[PDB]
């Protein structure tokens, strides 16, 4: 689990969004596994605006932050998981590391702020749903 809190937005994995998320929907994209809902209180996170390929992510199934190198956001085939069929996921970044289903929502961050959230796992990789192209998260 986990979310990004930027201004009056909550960014979560689409597959973990609550009824309250969907009832307060700003934007959602199944292909990216992302959903954004509205908040009352302002959030503590800043979104990275950059093309960094190195950063640190939080892994709940290890209670640890890991430094990783990761691929640029691309359209990637993902093997079936507990929460999705085998399918193509877009805007996805891969790194070598540990990721289980419960790790979804862990933040990947760089020097410029939050890059993305954990979205995929298995076969010794961790995948992150990028948010750095969502410039609209920074206003309104
Ligand atoms: O037992 C299972 C079966 N799996 C699946 O059902 C894959 O599809 C989905 C589809 C919809 C919702 C959640 C998961 C993955 C591996 N474990
Ligand atoms: O303390 C941390 C962890 N962080 C997170 O991403 C928390 O996310 C997860 C994912 C699943 C459940 C609970 C937490 C922020 C930076 N360091
Ligand atoms: Zn960066």
Swiss-Prot record:
Record: residues binding Zn(2+) 1: 50, 52, 110, 112
Catalytic activity of the protein: Selective cleavage of Tyr-|-Gly bond in the picornavirus polyprotein
Active site: 15, 33, 104
Signal peptide start and end residues: none
Chain's role: Cysteine protease that cleaves viral polyprotein and specific host proteins. It is responsible for the autocatalytic cleavage between the P1 and P2 regions, which is the first cleavage occurring in the polyprotein. Also cleaves the host translation initiation factor EIF4G1, in order to shut down the capped cellular mRNA translation. Inhibits the host nucleus-cytoplasm protein and RNA trafficking by cleaving host members of the nuclear pores. Counteracts stress granule formation probably by antagonizing its assembly or promoting its dissassembly.
Known partners and oligomeric status: Homodimer.
Name the UniProt record assigns to this protein: Protease 2A
Shown segment, full-protein numbering: 869 to 1008 of 2193
């Amino acid at each position: 689990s986990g979310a990004i809190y930027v201004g009056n937005y909550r960014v979560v994995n689409r597959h973990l969004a609550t009824h309250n998320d969907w009832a307060n929907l700003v934007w959602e994209d199944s292909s990216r596994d992302l959903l954004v809902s509205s908040t009352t209180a302002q959030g503590c996170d800043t979104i990275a605006r950059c093309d960094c390929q190195t950063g640190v992510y939080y892994c709940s199934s290890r209670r640890k932050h890991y430094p990783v190198s990761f691929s640029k956001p691309s359209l990637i085939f993902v093997e079936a998981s507990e929460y999705y069929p085998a399918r193509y996921q877009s805007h996805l970044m891969l790194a070598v590391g540990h990721s289980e289903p419960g790790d979804c929502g862990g933040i990947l961050r760089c020097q410029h702020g939050v890059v993305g959230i954990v979205s995929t796992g298995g076969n010794g990789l961790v995948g992150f749903a990028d948010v750095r192209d969502l410039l609209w998260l920074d206003e309104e």
